[PDB]
């Protein structure tokens, strides 16, 4: 067997929590 | 210092929000080819920061925010074919133990066999 192909496909995405501007 | 309440002394030195860091669903137990699935992942209270999630599997999953809970934030991804996903999310880099985690998912086999699905 042996997987010829490198690991599988890949993937990397992401986001961030940034609110407005802090007034509170 | 003078802890001795851990929170500090605790090991891992908290690491952070790794620990307000709550992730608990069904699509963190296995999904299905093509088949939309979901997870909650609770936060708010480490303080604001940034998440990066670094996907890898077969396919590229997609990932979708759902503020719908009251409080838990839903994250609903999709995966494209069996396999063993991995995914790896941390709080402004408070990976949590369980990433990179893994999300097997199955095509009408519930379970993606090596002698079944036969890989």
Same mark, same amino acid.
């Given at each position: 067997?042996?997987?010829?192909?490198?690991?599988?496909?890949?993937?990397?995405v992401?986001?961030?929590?940034?609110?407005?501007?802090?007034?509170? | 210092?003078? &802890?001795? *309440?851990?929170?500090?002394?605790?090991?891992?030195?908290?690491?952070?929000?790794? #620990?307000?860091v709550?992730?608990?669903?069904?699509?963190?137990?296995?999904?299905?080819?093509?088949? &939309?699935?979901?997870?909650?992942?609770?936060?708010?209270?480490?303080?604001?920061?940034?998440?990066?999630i670094?996907?890898?599997?077969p =396919?590229?999953?997609?990932?979708a925010?759902?503020?719908?809970?009251?409080? =838990?934030?839903?994250?609903?991804?999709?995966?494209?074919?069996?396999?063993?996903?991995?995914? =790896?999310?941390?709080?402004?880099?408070? #990976?949590?133990?369980?990433?990179? *985690?893994?999300?097997?998912?199955?095509?009408?086999?519930?379970?993606?066999?090596?002698?079944?699905?036969?890989?």
């Amino acid at each position: 067997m042996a997987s010829k192909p490198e690991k599988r496909v890949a993937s990397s995405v992401f986001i961030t929590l940034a609110p407005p501007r802090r007034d509170v | 210092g003078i &802890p001795e *309440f851990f929170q500090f002394t605790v090991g891992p030195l908290g690491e952070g929000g790794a #620990h307000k860091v709550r992730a608990g669903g069904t699509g963190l137990e296995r999904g299905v080819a093509g088949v &939309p699935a979901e997870f909650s992942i609770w936060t708010r209270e480490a303080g604001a920061g940034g998440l990066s999630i670094a996907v890898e599997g077969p =396919s590229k999953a997609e990932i979708a925010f759902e503020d719908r809970k009251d409080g =838990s934030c839903g994250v609903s991804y999709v995966v494209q074919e069996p396999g063993d996903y991995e995914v =790896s999310i941390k709080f402004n880099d408070e #990976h949590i133990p369980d990433s990179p *985690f893994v999300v097997p998912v199955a095509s009408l086999s519930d379970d993606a066999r090596r002698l079944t699905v036969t890989s």
